[model samples]
Target chain A: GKPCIICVAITGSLPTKENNPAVPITLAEQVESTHEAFEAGASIAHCHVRDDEGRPTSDPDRFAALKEGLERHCPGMIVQLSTGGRSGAGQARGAMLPLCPDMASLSVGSNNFPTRVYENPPDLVDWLAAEMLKYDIKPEIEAFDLSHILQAKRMAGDGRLAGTPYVQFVMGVRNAMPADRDVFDYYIHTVRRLFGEDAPWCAAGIGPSQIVLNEWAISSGGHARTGLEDNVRLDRDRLAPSNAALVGRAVELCEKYERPVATWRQARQILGLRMV
Target chain B: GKPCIICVAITGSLPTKENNPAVPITLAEQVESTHEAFEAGASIAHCHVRDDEGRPTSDPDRFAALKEGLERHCPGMIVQLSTGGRSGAGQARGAMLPLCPDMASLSVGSNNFPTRVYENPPDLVDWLAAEMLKYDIKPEIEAFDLSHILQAKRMAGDGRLAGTPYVQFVMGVRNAMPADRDVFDYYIHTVRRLFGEDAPWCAAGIGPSQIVLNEWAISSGGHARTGLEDNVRLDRDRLAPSNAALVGRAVELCEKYERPVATWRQARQILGLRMV
Candidate 1:
C-alpha cells in the first residue's frame, strides 16, 4: 500500500487479438507490449502465453520464449507467469514452473469460470507449491474467494510456501467473486488479520469492473492490476489501444491518490524477490 | 435473533459405517437416526443416500424410499436432500429434485475438495436453480467459499432462486473452507449486509471443528448444523455414539448461548417451506 505496484496482465487466455487489435498474442508482441508497460510505471508483468493456433496451452517452450524476451526487453521487471487452469489440465498447468523467472501465479482453490469450472485441485496446488519451492520461485497466491486467502495462510503455516505468502484478490468474474465493495474491504481486513497489517496485497477485476477495482484497491492502500487481458475496453464504445494504456489508467489513479507508482526495484524489494 | 434451526446431516457421502459405527448407512438406519436427532432438538434432516455396496449414489428411487421413511418416522421434521457433487456428477447430482423434499443443497461455485476439485460448473448451477424453482423446492446454498454467498444473492435478485436464500457457511473441510473466526464473523456480516439484518444464516464445521462452529453459530445468533456427516467424533479421543449424541452437543451449546432450538413448525416458517 505504501507504493502502488501496477501489474500489467499483458495477455490472458480469454482475450485475443480479435477482442482487441493490441492484445499481443505472439511472444514478440507480448514482449513489446510489456516493454511499453514497463516504461509506463508497470513493475510487474503477469503473463499467460498462447499456442501457435492462438489457443490457451501449457507449453513450457512458449513460456520460456516469453520469459526470455521479457527479461531481455523489459529488464528487471517482475515476470510473474500464470499457471491458470484455462491453459491446460492436470500437471500440464505447472510445466512452466521449472523455468522459474521470478514469480508465478497459483490459484489455491477451484471456482467457476464464465462457462466452466476452473479446477485447481488441492493435490495439484500442493505439487505446484512444491515445484515452486524446488525452483526457489515465489508464488503469487490468486485468491478467487475468501477461503483462498485463508487457504494461503494455511499453506504458509504448513510450509507449502516460503516466506510470507503474497495474496491477490480476484473479483468480478461471472459465477466467481463479484466486485462487491464490502467483500473487497473484508478481503483487505482478512489479509491484515492473517498476515499482519503490513502484508502487501493486490486486487484485480475483470472487464468493466477493472477500473472500479483499481480505484478501490488504490484508495484502500492496496496494489492494482490492469491490462487488456482482464478488459479490452477503455470505455463503452472504445477498445483500449494498448496494454500500456490500461496500466496508464492505474498509474493515473495512483497519482490521484498521491501514491507513487512502484518501480521495479521497489516492487522486487516489497515482494521479497531475489536480486537480478 | 429468533429460535436457531438445528439441522442434523446424519450421513454425508464421505462418511461410512467403517469410519463410525453410528453413521447410518442403510435407509432404515438413516430414518432411525434422523428420528432420534429430530427428537433431540434438530428441526431439519440434511440427508444423502448410500448404495448397497456402501458407496454414495444419486439414485432417485433410493431417495424416494428415504424420503418416505423419514416422513413416516419423523413427522413434521424437514427433509433436506444432498445434491452435493460427492454423490454424483453432472445432472445426476440433481436427479432427486423431482422427489421434492423440503429442501436440497446447492453449490453455486466450484472449489477444492480434500484431494479433488468439487466441480460445480455455471451451467449445472443454473440448471439446478431452475429445477428447484420449477419444483417449488427451497434451496440450502452450501457456501464453501465467500463467493457462493454473493452468488446466491445474484441468483435471488435475478429470479433464479425464490425467497431469501438460506445459506450455510461450511468450514473445516480438508481443502475447502476451514474453521476461522474472522471469516465466520465476516460471513455473518456479509449475509446481513446483502440479505437483510434479520436474514438467518447457519454454520457447520468438519471433523474436530464441529463443536467450534456450533458454539460460534449459537453464540452469534445463527443456526447450527451437526452430526456424523460432517464430523464423527465429539472430541479428539471419543467417537460420537450416535447422531442424537451429536445433536445433544448442539443442544448444550444452545443452552449455553441462551438461544432456543427451533421447532419444526418454526423452521418451516423461517425457511418458507410449504406445509405437508
Candidate 2:
C-alpha cells in the first residue's frame, strides 16, 4: 500500500464543546488541537471556525487567524479550511477562500443531511470552484453522493477546478450515503476511472464509521480522514480525548496495512499543494 | 429477459411547445398523448400537468382532470403522476398524491439539477413518502444519484415507504448523474443487492441519453422510461413526432433484446400496485 495521508477534522459545524470537551471551539484550542494531530501523523487539518457564541461561522478573519497559527505551530502541515454549507449561507461559505489556505472542502452537489437538505446549488458550486481557482487553493471535493465526484470531474474538465480534483467520499450521514464497503470500493474505482488510476482520493465517515472508513481507505491504498468533527467517540462508550487521539487511530490503521503515514511534505506532493 | 415496463413521461416540468410542438400541454392534450403512448406499448404514464399558460403546475385539479381522462380513454394503463420538485414548491409537489394514482415519482434525496438544486429535503421526502403510503400509491424512487438508491432502501427498511421501492435511475441530467455505462451497471447491481435479485427497476435519461438508457435498460432486463418530456428528438437531427414515437423506440429495444414489453397488469403485479 502507498503512504496514506491522514486529515484531521479538528472541528465541524455540528460538533461542539458539549459533544466532547476536546472538540476545539475557540481559535486557540483549534490551533493547539491541530498541532497535536499534526504531530500524530495528520498531514492536513480540515478546519471550521466557531463564533463567540460557539456556533459555526465562516468568518474570514477567524479563518485567517487559524491559518496563521497552524503555520506557526505545525510546520508544513496543510491547512484545509472548510467551505461546508452548514457553517454559512451562499457566498459567505467561500468567504475564507481569500485567506488562500492550501486546500478547501467544496461540495459540488446537494444531498440530505440528518434533518435538512445540504443545498449546494450549481451556481454556488461554480462560484466556490471559481474562487478556489482564483486563490490557487486546491479543492478537496466533498462527495456526499456519487454525482459530486462526476460533477468535480466535469468542473475540472471545463477549468473551473485546477488539476485533478481530489475527491473525499463522505459516508454514514443519516439521510445520505451510508458507510457501505461495496460502495466505498466503487467510489475508489470511479475516481480511478475518471481521474486516472494514480489520482489520490480520500474517505471520511461519521460516528463509528470514522474508524471503519479509516481502515478501508488505508488498506485500499487511499487516504483517510479522522478526528472529533466526524466522531466524538473513541469507542462505543468512550469519547475521544482530543483530535490527536482520533488521528492516532488512523495512524495505527496505516501501520496495520503496512502503509507508512504520509508526512506533510509527501502529502503536499501527492495532492499538488504548494509547499510552504 | 423479464417483461420490460415502458413508462412514457408525456409532459415534464421543463419541456414546452416551443422546444417541441409534440409536447402535450393542455389536459386534453396530455390525456390524448398518453392514450397514444399506451397504444404504442407504454404501460405507465409518468405525467406532469401544465397550466393554461403552458407552464408546469402541481394543481390537483389539473391532475384530477388528467387522471379522469386517462382512466376513461387509456383502459388498464397505469397512471403515474410526477411529484417532481420543479413542478411546485414544498408540499405542493405531493399535492396530487391524494388522487391515489397507481404510482407516483418520489425523490428521496436532493441533488444538483442543470442549473439549481433539486431540493428534496429530508422532511419533504418523508412527507411525500408518507402521503404515498397513506394513499396506497406505489412510489417509483427517482434516483438521480447513487445514494438515492441507498436512501430508498433505508426508507423502505423504515416504515416511511411501503413495500419494495420501484427505483428509476435518472441519468444525463447535466449537473446530476451522467449517462455513464459504469454507473448504469452499478445502479443495477446496487438495486439487486439492496432489493432482491428479481426486484424490478427502471431507467430514464435526458435528451439523447433517453434512447441510450432505453436500450441499456431493455437489454439488461430492466424497465425503461421515455417520451417527449424527457427528449423531443428521435436523433441528433430529427424531432420525435409524438410521445408515442418515443415509446415506439423503447419497444424496438425490447424486441432487440428479446424482452416482452410489460402490460399494465404485469407492471402493476411487478410493482405491487392494485390492478385496475
Candidate 3:
C-alpha cells in the first residue's frame, strides 16, 4: 500500500483566540504553527487567515503575510488556503483567490455549519475554479456529502477544475453529514465511483472524529488533515496543546501501521504542485 | 426511502459497574434499560451478560435471565446476544450459543482488541454457525474489516447462517479499521458489492466515531448501534448519562432527517428475527 499523506490545517476559517488561547491568529503565530507542523511531519498546511484582532479575515494582506512567513519559516511545506472565508460567498470568499499559494478550497455546495450555513453557490464554485486555474492553484474540493462530490465531478467534467482533482471529505458538522463510519463510507464510495482510482483525496473530520479519521485515512490509503484549527481535543476529553502535537500523533499512527509519512517534496509531487 | 434501523446496544460484552455505575450487569437492570431504549426509539437491543462480580459471562443462565427479563419488561425489542463472549476463540467464547437468543454475534475473523486478540478462528466460526442453526438463532455477522465481509459471505453461502442474514460493520478499534468515513465507505461498499441490495445490515463505531457513525447510518439509510459499551462520550467530551440517552439522541437525529425510527416489528422484519 502507498504511504499516507499528512496535511495539517494550521488555522481554521472560524475559531477565535477566545476559543482556545493557543489557536494561531496572528500572521507570525500562524507561520510558527505551520513550521512546527511541517517539522512534525505535515506535508501540507491548510491555511486560513486572521485579522489583527484575531478574527478570521479574507484580506489579501493577511494571506500574503502568512504565505511569505511560511516561505521564510518552512520553505518546502505546501500552503493551501481556504476559499471558505469568515463571511462566506461573494467578494469576501473570493477575495483570497489571486494570492494562490499552492491550493485553494472549493466547497462544492452550501451546507449548514454549526451555527450558520456555509454557502457556496454553483456560480461561485465556477468562478472560484476559474480563478484557481488563473493562478495555477489546485482546487481541493471540500465535500460535505455525497451530493457535493457529484457537484465536484460535474465541475471537473466541465473543465472548471485543473488536472486530476482532489477532494476533502469534511465530516462532523451538525446539519451536514454526521461523523460516522457509514457516512464516511458513503462519501468515499461516492467519490471513488465518481472520480475512479486515480483521484487524490483527503479527509478533514472535525471534533472527535479527527484522530479516528486520520487513522482511517492512513490505513485506507488516503490523505489526512489535522490540527487545532479543526479540533481542539486529542481525544474526546483532552485539548490538544498545539497543531504540531496533532500532527505528531497522526505521524505515530502512520508509523504504527508501518505506513511512512510523506514529506513536503513528496507531497508536492503526489499532488502535482509546481516546484517553487 | 426506508428509515434506518436503530439497534441500541444496551450493554456491551465488556465494561462493568466499575466503568460506568449505570451499565447494567444484573438481568433486571438490563431489562429496565432495554425497555427505556425501546421507548426512546430503539428497535433492537444488542446484549451481553455479566456475573455477580460484573465481569463478562457467557453463562446460559445470564442469557436466559436477560431474555426472560426483556420478555417481561419490553415484550417486543429484539434481543441480540453476543457469541463474541470473553474476546477469544475458546469454549468460554462459544458457551452462550445453546441459550439461543434471537440473534447471536458471528465475528468473521480475529483482530486486536485493546490488550488482547479477539480470536475468531474459521473452525470456531464454522462451529458457531452450526450451533446457531441447531439453536434456531439468526446470526448477526460482525465484520471489522473489508476482508471479514467476504469471509462472512462464505459462511453465509455455506449455510452456516439463518435464511435472512444480518451484518454489522464494526469500526474504530485500534488494530482494526479506523472509525472514519473513508474506511467506513470501503467496508460498506465492499459489503454492498458482496451482499447486494437485499442484505440487511447495521453499522457500529467505537469511541468518538460513535455519534458520527449513528448520524451517518441515519442519513445514508442504514441501521446504527449505540451505547456506553461501544462509546462513553456523548459528544467528543461529555460522558453519556446512559445508553438510553445515546439512543434518544439517535432518535432525534433520525427525526431531523425525517426518517422514522424503526419499531420492534420493523426491526424483526428487517433482521429476519422471529416476531414475538
Largest DockQ belongs to which candidate? 2
Across residues B1-276, which tens digit of lDDT does each residue of candidate 1 receive?
A: 359899999999989777899999998899889999999999999999999998999999999999999999898999899998888999998999999888999998889888788999999999999999888889999899999999999999999988899999999988888888988988998899999998878999999899999999999989999999999997879889999999999999888887888989999998898886
Model 1 lDDT, residue B180, Cα:
86
Q: State the lDDT of candidate 2 residue by residue for B1-276, as single tens digits.
A: 688899999989989888999999998788888999999999999989888899889999999999999999997999999998888999999888899999999999998888888899899899888898899989899999999999899888877888778899999998999999999999999999999998899999999999999999889989999998889999989999899999999999898999899988988788887867
Best by TM-score: 2
For candidate 3, the docking band is incorrect
DockQ for every prediction shown: 0.90, 0.92, 0.01
Q: What's the best-to-worst order under lDDT?
A: 2, 1, 3
Give per-residue CA lDDT, model 1, range A53-79, as digits (tens). Answer: 898888999999999998898889999
- A97-195, model 2: which lDDT tens digit per residue? 998899999999998999899899889988998998898999999899998898889888998989899999999998999999999999999999999
Q: Could you tell which candidate, 2 or 3, scores higher by TM-score?
A: 2
Candidate 2 residue spans exceeding 4 A from truth: none
